[PDB]
């Protein structure tokens, strides 16, 4: 079928069953590793806890001593009561009006694929920026991140990224506007 290839990639990744409480993380890591090889990105797997691999894809900048841009996202999704769905939550069915139904279609596999396709387009079209970009794909966010991002930020592999600024998920907005979570200085929850 005729379909934009970014949408096809999104639907592929929606079909990987990274659903709690036992996500298919092995298949997600393999998908990111193969994507890194196709895109010509460096790939580092950091197993922060047994069974919990953080995958980092890296596009080095022209000034690699500047701090980097982190494009972060989580690979797990919350459970389903599948009897209440119009389409199988792991089929990634796209209806004739263009709607893609899946657990993860909003939270947050869309963003992971958007980062990957934006990088692919900019890189293959010949753009180069001073700052390195790292895409980090972490497990375990939907249960509090205690075997995922909370551990990753103490790792030497994390410190080596020399992060200068991160993006991660927002939330859908039903209006024409977009929501953005803003924080500055020390975050309010450590103030304390």
């Amino acid at each position: 079928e005729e379909e934009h290839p970014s949408v096809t990639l999104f639907r592929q990744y929606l079909r990987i069953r990274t659903v709690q409480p036992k996500p298919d993380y092995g298949a997600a890591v393999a998908f990111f590793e193969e994507t890194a090889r196709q895109l010509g990105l460096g790939c580092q797997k950091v197993e922060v806890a047994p069974g919990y691999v953080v995958t980092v894809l890296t596009w080095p900048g022209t000034n690699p001593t500047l701090s980097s841009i982190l494009l972060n996202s989580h690979t797990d999704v919350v459970p389903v009561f599948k009897e209440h769905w119009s389409h199988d939550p792991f089929e990634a069915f796209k209806d004739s009006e263009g709607y893609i139904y899946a657990r993860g279609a909003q939270d947050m596999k869309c963003v992971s694929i958007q980062y990957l396709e934006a990088v692919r387009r900019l890189k293959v079209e010949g753009h180069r920026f001073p700052r390195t970009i790292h895409m980090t794909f972490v497990p375990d966010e939907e249960v509090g991140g205690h075997q995922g991002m909370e551990l990753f930020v103490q790792r030497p592999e994390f410190h080596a990224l020399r992060a200068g600024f991160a993006l991660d998920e927002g939330i859908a907005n039903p209006t024409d506007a977009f929501t953005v979570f803003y924080s500055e200085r020390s975050p309010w929850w450590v103030r304390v």
């Binding site: 119009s86 909003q106 991660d168 039903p174 209006t175 953005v180 975050p187």
Partner: protein, 88 residues
């Protein structure tokens, strides 16, 4: 905040209306912000019902594709912020 400045400039270039909201004390950013890294939470979904964690969670393909376009403009801006005191 040079990062917010660059993000906000791209959104003005693209005519995107932003609604800044407080950052939840949850998610990956809880940990990244707590170790001192500046961050924003953003998913380019507008005209989309709020369905995270719900039945029939769905996203229209044109909103998804416009989202890839938005990141193709955000990435050059963020990755081209010139050297800062924090880079030394």
């Amino acid at each position: 905040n040079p990062w917010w400045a660059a993000f906000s400039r791209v959104c003005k270039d693209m005519n995107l209306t932003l609604e800044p909201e407080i950052m939840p004390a949850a998610g990956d950013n809880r940990y990244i912000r707590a170790v001192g890294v500046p961050a924003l939470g953003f998913s380019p979904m507008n005209r989309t019902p709020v369905l995270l964690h719900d039945h029939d969670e769905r996203l229209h393909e044109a909103v998804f594709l416009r989202g890839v376009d938005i990141y193709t403009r955000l990435l050059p801006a963020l990755a081209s912020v010139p050297a800062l005191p924090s880079d030394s």
